[PDB]
Amino acid sequence: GQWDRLVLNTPSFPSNYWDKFVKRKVLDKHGDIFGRERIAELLGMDLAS
Amino acid sequence: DIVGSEAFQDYVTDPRGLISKKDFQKAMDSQKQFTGPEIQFLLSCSEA
């Protein structure tokens, strides 16, 4: 569990797996409650970009 | 439930633990627990 925190900010997290929008779905699910910008920083993605 | 919410605890500014009226409105609106018409009723019931 501690080791899995390394790929959260990487831009190649959904590699070697069918889905590539998992970060987008996580953002759309948890942003309204835990802070959209906070989740964006946690997942290493830019909503403006 | 809102006391344990980080999105409202961060908005809490007073060292004594007090939360400004406007800040407490914005906290509800961010957490989306209560809708707009309900916001005013909660404001009224709050200890002005």
Side-chain angles (χ1 to χ4, degrees), chain A, chain B residues 1-19 21-48:
Chain A
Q2 323 294 326
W3 190 250
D4 289 341
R5 201 168 300 111
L6 306 186
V7 279
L8 299 184
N9 283 332
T10 65
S12 182
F13 169 65
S15 175
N16 206 6
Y17 170 55
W18 324 119
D19 182 30
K20 262 66 168 191
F21 325 111
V22 52
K23 286 184 296 186
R24 187 256 311 179
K25 304 162 57 182
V26 168
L27 171 59
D28 301 354
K29 173 188 178 187
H30 309 278
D32 56 343
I33 278 304
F34 293 64
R36 173 175 182 180
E37 68 301 19
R38 184 181 271 161
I39 272 54
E41 306 299 341
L42 185 49
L43 304 167
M45 80 191 328
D46 187 15
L47 70 155
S49 177
Chain B
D1 298 355
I2 205 60
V3 61
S5 56
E6 293 183 358
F8 163 78
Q9 270 277 358
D10 58 351
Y11 283 49
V12 177
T13 62
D14 186 19
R16 200 186 318 112
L18 282 295
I19 173 68
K21 259 303 185 177
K22 49 167 305 306
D23 302 2
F24 153 83
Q25 180 180 7
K26 318 308 161 52
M28 300 151 218
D29 188 13
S30 305
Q31 201 72 5
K32 306 175 181 182
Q33 293 183 356
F34 333 101
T35 80
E38 311 169 358
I39 305 307
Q40 329 303 334
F41 175 86
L42 310 171
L43 292 157
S44 308
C45 301
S46 306
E47 169 261 356

